[PDB]
Amino acid sequence: LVVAASIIGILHLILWIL
Amino acid sequence: LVVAASIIGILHLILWIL
Amino acid sequence: LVVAASIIGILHLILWIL
Amino acid sequence: LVVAASIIGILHLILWIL
């Protein structure tokens, strides 16, 4: 769960900045 | 907490995409 | 961190629904 | 991951309130 949340949170957070 | 956050984060993230 | 994130995530998520 | 998510979640959450 931490590995998946880390991947989705990273890419998910980047998309918000864009 | 991880199990609940994982369920809410998954469904919660899906709702945003829609 | 999990205890705090759980409290902020819970109340933080509720505020979004409202 | 928890240390990084905690830093990004904290500052990331503050930016939303502003």
Residues 6 or more apart whose Cβ sits within 8 Å of residue B12: C13
Chain C residues with beta carbon closer than 8 angstroms to that of D5 = 1, 5
The method of structure determination was: NMR
D1 to chain A, closest Cα gap in Å? 7
- For helices C2-17 and B2-17, angle between their N-to-C axes, nearest 10 degrees: 30
Task: Please check whether residue D17 is in contact with residue C15, taking contact to mean a CB–CB distance below 8 angstroms.
Answer: no
3-state DSSP percent of chain B in helix, strand and coil, to 5? 90, 0, 10
Q: In sequence order, which residues have a C-beta less than 8 Å from that of residue B16 and are 6 or more positions away?
A: none
In angstroms, rounded to a whole number, what is the distance separating the alpha carbons of residues C13 and D1? Answer: 21
From chain B, pick out residues whose CB is under 8 angstroms from the CB of C3: 1
